[PDB]
Design a protein around this ligand. Sequence first.
Ligand code: SF4
Ligand code: SF4
Ligand code: FES
Ligand SMILES: [K+]
Ligand SMILES: [Zn+2]
Lengths: 126, 95, 90, 114, 48, 86, 208, 688
Amino acid sequence: TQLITVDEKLDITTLTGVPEEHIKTRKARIFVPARNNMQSGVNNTKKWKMEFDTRERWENPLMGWASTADPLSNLVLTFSTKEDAIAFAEKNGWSYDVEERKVPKPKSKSYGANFSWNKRTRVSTK
Amino acid sequence: GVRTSPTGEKVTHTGQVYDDEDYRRVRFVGRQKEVNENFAIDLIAEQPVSQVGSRVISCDGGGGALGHPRVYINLDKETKTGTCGYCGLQFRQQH
Amino acid sequence: ALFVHRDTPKNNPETPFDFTPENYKRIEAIVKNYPEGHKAAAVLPVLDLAQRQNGWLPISAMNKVAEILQVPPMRVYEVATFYTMYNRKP
Amino acid sequence: TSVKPIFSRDMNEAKRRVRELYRAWYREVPNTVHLFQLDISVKQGRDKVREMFKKNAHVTDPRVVDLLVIKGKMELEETINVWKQRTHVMRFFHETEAPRPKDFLSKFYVGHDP
Amino acid sequence: PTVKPPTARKFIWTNHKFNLSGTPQQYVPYSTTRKKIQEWVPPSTPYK
Amino acid sequence: LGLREIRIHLCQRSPGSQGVRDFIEKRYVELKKANPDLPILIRECSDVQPKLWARYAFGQEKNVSLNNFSADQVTRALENVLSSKA
Amino acid sequence: TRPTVRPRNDVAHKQLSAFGEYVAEILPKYVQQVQVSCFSELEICIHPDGVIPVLTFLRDHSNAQFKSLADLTAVDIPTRQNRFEIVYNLLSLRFNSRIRVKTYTDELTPVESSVSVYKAANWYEREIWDMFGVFFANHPDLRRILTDYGFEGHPFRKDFPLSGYVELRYDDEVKRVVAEPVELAQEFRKFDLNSPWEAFPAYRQPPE
Amino acid sequence: SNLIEVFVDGQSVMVEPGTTVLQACEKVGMQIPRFCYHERLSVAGNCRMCLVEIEKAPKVVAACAMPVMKGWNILTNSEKTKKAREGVMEFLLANHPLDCPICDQGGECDLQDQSMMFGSDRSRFLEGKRAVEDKNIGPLVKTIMTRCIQCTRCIRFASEIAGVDDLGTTGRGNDMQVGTYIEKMFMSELSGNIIDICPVGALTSKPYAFTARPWETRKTESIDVMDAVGSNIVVSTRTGEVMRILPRMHEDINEEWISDKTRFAYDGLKRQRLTEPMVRNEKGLLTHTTWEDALSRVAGMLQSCQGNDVAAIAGGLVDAEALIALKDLLNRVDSDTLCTEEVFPTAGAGTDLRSNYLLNTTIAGVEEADVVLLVGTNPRFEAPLFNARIRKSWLHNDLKVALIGSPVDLTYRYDHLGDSPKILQDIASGSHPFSQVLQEAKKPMVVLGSSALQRNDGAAILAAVSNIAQKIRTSSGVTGDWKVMNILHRIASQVAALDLGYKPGVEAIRKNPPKMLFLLGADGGCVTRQDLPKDCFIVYQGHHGDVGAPIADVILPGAAYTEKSATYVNTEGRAQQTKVAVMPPGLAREDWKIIRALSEIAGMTLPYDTLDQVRNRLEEVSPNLVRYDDVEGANYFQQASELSKLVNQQLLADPLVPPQLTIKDFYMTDSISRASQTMAKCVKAVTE
Ligand code: SF4
Ligand code: SF4
Ligand code: FES
Ligand SMILES: [K+]
Ligand SMILES: [Zn+2]
């Protein structure tokens, strides 16, 4: 036979060594990251990301540095699809919320519309 | 151009001084608060405005490659001098 | 040789400029050369008319041309700085 | 849904391996308290062993409990052979860690953590 | 520097100091920035 | 002590909410005229099962499933809610 | 393209492509992909049931003789359902060549240990147990090799954080080094460095 | 279909006729480099960075402007495409100043990035550069015009989206300068988006200036609460401190823009902040105290209340979690008196049906309308991106807009029908000429401002506007899927408070005044201690000490919108959630956490412990508050119209005047904007 049948839900939380506070109180966010509106490039909107809820950052008394007690504060995971990210979050016992991919809708562009005879879409300058 | 708070603590060129009721002054007790007393905002105000006969001037901060990236400053405003964004030296068109 | 305006006491938006009535009849004749809905097409002659009455263009001729043609004043400033005949200095 | 096993074909062989690992830890706790010269009792160390076994008691996947038995055997091998020091044995007893706020109200008082 | 002297600057220390660690003149670190969040100060007058 | 608000959750499109929709299209106006100072919050949503929430005095809420009811069954459940006031 | 561009080696590319065809047709039971990179390195991507038959082939076949195990490696790629990519780097001293054998596993499927092929693997896959959590079946002494003795978790997994979950200090009350949950006086500052402009059009993935 | 076949690098793709070369390459996932093209601006075609080879054509074409012909093979990576890109990048960098270390655009600069990606690695320019005089266009946009690459995104934005026509190009040739030509101050409500679309550091944020740098910023995706539009934003933080607020692209809300209040009011979020619980001492002064003492002193008074003895006013910035928190808490005391500051008329259906207080069409449905009637609103300042969507429909769909109210500037031309409300009775009777315009319209849209409902005849105004909408929809050529009746809200907390069942307006408190009053962020000054009895126990819960905090007995320091994961519902009914960007300062806590802790101190503990359990309660009260980025359609306009015909409320003779006539009244509306030094500089800049 050399193969067994496991119908149970895949759960590896007891094997990952993560303490329980950072399993059951964290909210993973699964999302395609929004485009930086400072830039027109879209190559950072191609993949899915999993981040976690931001915890407390406080002031270091000595230097004023940003101290944290969150181990997952810098953990950003990359996924090719939404379903891979959902399967990875469910596998690790992380409660998650998923935002859908926001694509820009197709625009109707016409350079001749800048110089219409009777429409408001005439440019007053160029 | 250093000054002193009413607690006796020196104010840095940033403007940092601890409050009177701030406990973190205890780190200077028996020790010193290291401040630099050469405030760069006061020293660049001591430099005279360079009168040039051009409309656009270039500044690299002196020393050529030992200065900053060479930038070009327009001098069309006669109300305001033209200040270098790197070194703070300021220029005026003499006409 | 500059393409910004600074308000001087002899060139400001309160400098007195107004067309003569015969120049208003000439402006009406200019505006009637263009289709209805394209009165902005009379920016270049009328502004030049403001240069033929005054000799040059303070920024009240530009504002008056913008006012009587119902175009924004920036769209008259663009024309007055684009074309090399419009004397923006006396 | 047809996966390759590690050691156990089902959950009964898996519970057998869990049970033998618990027997081995139960036998080892007095020797561990003696040779590491721990300040705990044998009853307290056996309660910690029972706590660590009951922490994983919800698992129904045979491969996951096979890996839990494998990791428990590794911890036991590091304990029987003196590879752990006293500090590694006492890390199961979080003694210097202050008790966390449990209810809603004390977690509200101390900070922002849910 | 007797032969080739260093370039004079108004900001270079005229008095060199040695390692001052272990003395009352030693460096003590501190945050050089100001307070980020301004708190609301309640009014000093009563509310009746 | 008495009823404080009524909440009716329903779908816009599901057939199980259909009788509930048939309650609001026909019988809600005279219901609101009969109970002018009672908030009867109709909340439509995308895929919810029909539901009748009755909040009473001191925060007590009863919960009645309105799934696959006719308009007469919604009327009878809602008038049981109005006449109970428990 | 002479001075600044790396020169392409077409002879080694053709030879490694022919040998990849050779391996793929001798062992079609396990070989899934064969690829040769543009800098002429051969990768044989296999099914994990053929760890022992492929590696014993490359070690013992007269046209392969990959006697040296240079390195054994896992790579964590969490978007794959078999997230761990087990990488064997082999050296043939006879034919002066290198080959890469790649396979895959998830957290729960054991990979067969290759200590019976290369004894060099004994620590490497042991490291793969310590760093990634991949269990190797029929390993002689499989245990941790690099982490601390009571260490929980597998650090080179990409969902394991950079600083861990615990940190050590000496506590003078208990006269002992103790483990506590990690607090950093300065948080590691995450830098978002990726440009939003495409760098390499040759590697463009086809869209949805 | 009439799709034509074109080729991008040999790959076939079927495109609509009129598709540009750039869009055809976008359909196969290739982004052509650009500087002047922007997909929400008109096509300029003057940076020439998008020049691409079409094969069997001996001339590169401008891909942003050139429509594809059938059978073109677009060569995005060919040799002369790359040479065209390198030459154009060389000309862009010839006169560009060496300012990257002192420029705020560095790291998020399009010119830097596609100089790295598509330009050469070195310079051949052996001359002196031009240097351009800087302009002064206001306290928001720092202007360093030597960095300008003359892409005219400035001018197209200010002309087409902002509707301003004050930016332009003066001069000619290399001396061509983008500016205003005069000392003129570009202060729109949307003036900060030219910082976004400027590809270079020529237009930067003056408040954000020099402080941070994009690679070290953490990006938290969140929601605006400065109005009821619900603009999606990025709060960019750095080391636990909010650095700036950028837009997120949401095609149906804020397309990629935000208002200047949204963009720049975040520095009010670090002034005047409530950081510790305060109670009144023996002298009657607010002194700092612990959470135990403050919650005990509130809960001891809450246990002595019952019925109308305790009430609550919700402010403008309150999330739905704290709203249902305080609602459940006061319902444990058997109090239904939970009010909002913004008055919605409860006559007829009231807040029972969702449709009579929503923007039922949508923000996006403005693009489907052909006639818009604005009643009693100034949507330029009440909901600036709703006004931007109206201007986009005006510009591209030839939308007819009419206004009943004071003749405010809306940045487009409308038909001002007059400011008297009796015109609403003339349109509903057909005697008015715009009534026939509404009858012959196919997709009409009637938008009643919620600021017009603040009048004493707000029920009569709502009844007249609903009468117009139901005269149209039941009789004229409206399909039935189309929603005519719309209400534009201006308060971010309002729609979630109406969905949860609050009583809008504070008339329930003026009717019978309580001996205990909660103020969740209530800074509108709607109820002061002259309206309360002799010693009313006022509890202010909020994040700023502005209006309600100096008169309070106990202050409960709460979280702001950047400081909590929090549900807000916009004017169209779309529920959205913020995310935690930073934590609240000091001893301040999340708002429903405070109310739940108070309920546990008072012995009336609410059945939730985590945020998910609050959202389960929130789903129990109305299940659309937890379906995020979903507009749930609300039916039953006929039943609300039949209920509105019961009481004949009379229209007042006072004209419809919105409270915000000019840009002066825009910048300070809530407690965060009033605490903002940037908004104060904006007010001082527009009043001079
Ligand atoms: S705009 Fe871009 S290229 Fe120009 S100085 Fe700024 S960062 Fe550098
Ligand atoms: S300032 Fe910026 S947006 Fe305006 S034309 Fe120049 S480069 Fe373009
Ligand atoms: S992008 Fe087409 S020319 Fe500027
Ligand atoms: K910019
Ligand atoms: Zn300089």
